[PDB]
Amino acid sequence: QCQDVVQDVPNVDVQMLELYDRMSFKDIDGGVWKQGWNIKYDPLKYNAHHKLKVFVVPHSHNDPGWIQTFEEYYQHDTKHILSNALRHLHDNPEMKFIWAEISYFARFYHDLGENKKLQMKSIVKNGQLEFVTGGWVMPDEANSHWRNVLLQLTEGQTWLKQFMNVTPTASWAIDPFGHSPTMPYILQKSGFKNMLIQRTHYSVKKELAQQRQLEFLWRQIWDNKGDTALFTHMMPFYSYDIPHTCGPDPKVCCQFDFKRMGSFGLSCPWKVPPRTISDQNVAARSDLLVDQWKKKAELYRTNVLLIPLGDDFRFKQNTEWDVQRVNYERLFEHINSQAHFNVQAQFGTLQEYFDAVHQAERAGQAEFPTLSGDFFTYADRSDNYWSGYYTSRPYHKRMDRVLMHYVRAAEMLSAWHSWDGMARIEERLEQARRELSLFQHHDGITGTAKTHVVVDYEQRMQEALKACQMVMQQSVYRLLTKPSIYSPDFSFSYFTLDDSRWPGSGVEDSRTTIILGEDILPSKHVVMHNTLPHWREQLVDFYVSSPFVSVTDLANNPVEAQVSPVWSWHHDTLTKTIHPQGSTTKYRIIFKARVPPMGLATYVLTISDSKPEHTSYASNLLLRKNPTSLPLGQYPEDVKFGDPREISLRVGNGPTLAFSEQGLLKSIQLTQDSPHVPVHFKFLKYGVRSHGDRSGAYLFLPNGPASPVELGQPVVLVTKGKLESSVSVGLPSVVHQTIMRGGAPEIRNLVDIGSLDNTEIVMRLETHIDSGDIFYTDLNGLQFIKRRRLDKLPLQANYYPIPSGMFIEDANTRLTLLTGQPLGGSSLASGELEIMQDRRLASDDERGLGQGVLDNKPVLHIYRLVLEKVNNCVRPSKLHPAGYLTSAAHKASQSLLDPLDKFIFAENEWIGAQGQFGGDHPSAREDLDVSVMRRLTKSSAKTQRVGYVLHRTNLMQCGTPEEHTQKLDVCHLLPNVARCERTTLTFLQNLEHLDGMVAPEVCPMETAAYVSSHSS
Ligand SMILES: CC(C)(C)c1ccc(CC[C@H]2CC[C@@H](O)[C@@H]3[C@H](O)[C@H](O)CN23)cc1
Ligand SMILES: [Zn+2]
């Protein structure tokens, strides 16, 4: 039944890792096609019986924020583009136009009067205006999580189905900076038949063009059968603009951009202007244009040619619509009437192009190659590799992952009930989904926008977090209060969220202290939520106003707890040291919470006069020369001091970690008997070139390999507890922390690059693992792909996105680093892993942004570090392009991305409180996730509908007995089920009516969607 994703290497015509190994990547002058060759064709190829069919496709690339904000561009440009498209298409029935960004289209359509709404629907229904992709945005493909690529796709397509009555089946991605196979994966499971891409390495375009492999069936790297395949068109030239879309010679194509004659303030840099088409020049102009088209056609296999016609924010002015349309109409009338050309040219849409290509395929005219792999890391010219944006603006990259999880938790917690309109649940969730979707844009999460635009995206995401908190806390109050007592004010705050890692300690003082006292309040209820569909334990922590606090469950059973101080790090501008201060007023309490699948668990925190029986207190040791006292108020244990030294720590039965005198990891010992395996953390810095091209928001152009950060004699703080221990050190630009709770450690870096211009800070791991030139990185949090370091390419070409994790391995040992934020990284030598923390760049890199990156702010990066023996694991063969996580590594990733949520009851007494929700939910096998749970109907619908996205990853078999778990049937999670359907991933089309109303579990590496219908 299920394909084996480990043991069968797919047979494909093009495999990108293998192609990379063989290619030479020489950057030679190809002539007018600077990165190609002088294309030749046989004029006799086309004739009366075999004509070249040419589709000229007008378009306008509209960024939802870049140099201006979304709203600034809407007011200045996009509202005029859309208004004039409506008028011009209405008045000219043969003219066509494609549109990608639904965030803008929705913003426009809601402001139109009814007369114009009807006109707009008519030009869509008749095929003149065609939506391509239909997502909220055209997202980044490097840093984005697959869950959020799906979220923004669904937001735009749901809008289109409701208001336009259409669902695109062709995708258009002309500007993201390199391309991911996560896109065809999601698109093919969302009803798509075709997709188009543009920004791939110039050497890749040349190689594929020579073999006519620019159109291909793109399947996943593990897919042996080919059921994931999606037909893909790669454009062949340097840009999507008119000079790089008519043919190989931009000096010629520029003459066919009729906006460049002067009055629009545009010109042709190749020094020959366009000229108005007339009866006296149309034969010579047609000669030149058809010659360009026939050259382009030589690179493809059918007699159907795609010619995009557009650029950024084009088709704004009425006069521009006229100048392009009238000149092209004169060319078509001539060309189409001159038999000697054997061409039929017309305005078209993207779908019309793909339909004609496949008609040719079915007529036996062409067969297409199969392809797997990705298209990172992009270079547009010379050694200019776009690996800088894997790290740029890292504060907002981390915020993306925080809001990702809060959107999932708010949608899931509120899905359990139907809500009155007055509760504003749908309103708040729509806002949250739309702001997170907007940020997936290729100038949002990428960190490539102007400073004031980054500020706009941040403000929008903060509003979205506040929306999620409101929805979550109203839902907890309803799920855990006796129904006949439940008395909501939908504007009131019953709970406040407590989040230990966002914005994080030393970033923002945002967390509330639980205030207890004999003369004010003896106790406080807290609740934990677990969005994952299996029973979960996790340590949780809260700030409390006394160290003498104990924890009980809601059966009044004692729960073991640990109290630690609250430590903050300060750059002391007097002593010129970075050192910690302990609170005299607040303390941390830590305990293990145990929470049902997709459920809630309540605990109680109670003050006492003295040390509680079931609460312990951490010891604290400050290692530094020249110490001064550190008082901690009521904290029962005195801080200890010492000169810097090496130290070792072990929590529970977990690993034993050894640290250098500078507070950095030096070894891990897995068990009592086992070796101390060398695993060393080191911080280094890259700089910028003093001559030639400069690093900026997009480009990473280092001045050689990185140099060690000079550490001096840093201050190291060691906290030792029964439940949690840690080592923290104040380094220049980074407070580095290693935390131990009995399994793989958690690493946290508080990164403040300060005023260090032209510096990139990297965290490196050095091991003696015999990895050679191989490492693995993930794609969109969905899959791990094999990388090979290539010494034939420069350092920056060997950097890849690290959206969620990376690893190196040999026959016996693996080291995996999981991340809570997307960052750039590599393995530049055998046994090494490295990941960039932040970058501050004084110069612009000449890709249109017009500024460096000088707006850095403190960010708390989070990680898990997993060292494992792998000699017993069943792994793919040497030729397989994929890799897979172990159970421990996958759970460590989930701990970063989807932790327990923590709620503190706001008032003094919670009347009607209950102890647990979800105790009867099935606890599914560990590789299965409910990625999305979303109610799809408002309260007035007679038949309620709930949508689920189910994802099964693939974990290595390494000899651990599988325990029994329960089957998860999402269609029976809510009562009174009347129907269960399998749908596309956007929920917009029903694909299968399911027997017995049971939703089957999915295969490894597959994602399915189901909708349950319920009688209400
Ligand atoms: C020549 C000059 C002015 C430096 C320049 C260079 C490049 C560009 C286009 C940049 C591309 C790729 C990066 C990307 O950030 C931008 C926006 O998303 C916009 O849609 C055009 N894109 C625009 C202008
Ligand atoms: Zn763009």
Curated annotation (Swiss-Prot):
It catalyses: N(4)-{beta-D-GlcNAc-(1->2)-alpha-D-Man-(1->3)-[alpha-D-Man-(1->3)-[alpha-D-Man-(1->6)]-alpha-D-Man-(1->6)]-beta-D-Man-(1->4)-beta-D-GlcNAc-(1->4)-beta-D-GlcNAc}-L-asparaginyl-[protein] + 2 H2O = 2 alpha-D-mannopyranose + an N(4)-{beta-D-GlcNAc-(1->2)-alpha-D-Man-(1->3)-[alpha-D-Man-(1->6)]-beta-D-Man-(1->4)-beta-D-GlcNAc-(1->4)-beta-D-GlcNAc}-L-asparaginyl-[protein]. The keyword Nucleotide-binding does not apply. Pathway: Protein modification; protein glycosylation. Belongs to the glycosyl hydrolase 38 family. GO terms for biological process: encapsulation of foreign target; mannose metabolic process; N-glycan processing; protein glycosylation; rhodopsin biosynthetic process. Homodimer; disulfide-linked. Zn(2+) binds at residues 61, 63, 175, 442. SUPFAM superfamilies: Families 57/38 glycoside transferase middle domain, Galactose mutarotase-like, Glycoside hydrolase/deacetylase. Binds 1 zinc ion per subunit. Residues 1-1016 are lumenal. Its EC number is 3.2.1.114. Its main location: Golgi. Its cofactor is Zn(2+). It is found in: Golgi apparatus membrane. GO terms for molecular function: alpha-mannosidase activity; carbohydrate binding; mannosidase activity; mannosyl-oligosaccharide 1,3-1,6-alpha-mannosidase activity; metal ion binding. It comes from the Eukaryota. Gene3D superfamilies: 2.60.40.1360, Glycoside hydrolase 38, N terminal domain, Glycoside hydrolase family 38, central domain, Golgi alpha-mannosidase II, Golgi alpha-mannosidase II, domain 4. Induction: Inhibited by swainsonine and by copper sulfate. Keywords: Disulfide bond, Glycosidase, Golgi apparatus, Hydrolase, Membrane, Metal-binding, Signal-anchor, Transmembrane, Transmembrane helix, Zinc. GO terms for cellular component: endoplasmic reticulum; Golgi membrane; Golgi stack. Catalyzes the first committed step in the biosynthesis of complex N-glycans. It controls conversion of high mannose to complex N-glycans; the final hydrolytic step in the N-glycan maturation pathway. It is a single-pass type II membrane protein. This is Alpha-mannosidase 2. The active site is at 175 (nucleophile). The gene is alpha-Man-IIa.
